[PDB]
Amino acid sequence: XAXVXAXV
Amino acid sequence: XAXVXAXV
DNA sequence: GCGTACGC
DNA sequence: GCGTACGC
Ligand SMILES: *C(=O)c1cnc2ccccc2n1
Ligand SMILES: *C(=O)c1cnc2ccccc2n1
Ligand SMILES: *C(=O)c1cnc2ccccc2n1
Ligand SMILES: *C(=O)c1cnc2ccccc2n1
């Protein structure tokens, strides 16, 4: 759920 | 030569 | 519940 | 001349 690339 | 992952 | 970020 | 970065 972590947004470091994807943002879900 | 750009270091944003790799660093060469 | 998915994918970003770059040039000596 | 290569590869990093993370969990609601
Ligand atoms: C957040 O913890 C999280 C964990 N697993 C995932 C798997 C696939 C897409 C997004 C996800 N987000
Ligand atoms: C971003 O797109 C992305 C893709 N894979 C990962 C793996 C581990 C940590 C962070 C990540 N971020
Ligand atoms: C830096 O500009 C640069 C450009 N191309 C590369 C290709 C492969 C590895 C490292 C590189 N660094
Ligand atoms: C870091 O490992 C990495 C890998 N691929 C890329 C593509 C485009 C811009 C930056 C990147 N960084």
User: CA–CA distance from B8 to each of A1, A3, A5, A7, A8 (Å)?
Assistant: 31, 26, 22, 28, 31
**Cβ(B7)–Cβ(B1) below 8 Å:** no
For residues B5 and A5, what is the distance between their CA atoms, to the nearest angstrom? 12
For residues B4 and A5, what is the distance between their CA atoms, to the nearest angstrom? 13
User: CA–CA distance from A6 to each of A1, B1, B2, B5, B7 (Å)?
Assistant: 9, 25, 22, 16, 22
For residues A1 and A5, what is the distance between their CA atoms, to the nearest angstrom? 11
The secondary structure of A1-8 as a DSSP string is --------
Q: Which amino acid is at A4?
A: V
- Short-list A7, A5, A2, CA closest to B5: A5
Experimental approach: X-ray
Specify the resolution in Å.
Answer: 2.0
Stated in angstroms, how far is A8 CA from D1 C1'? 34
Stated in angstroms, how far is B3 CA from D1 C1'? 11
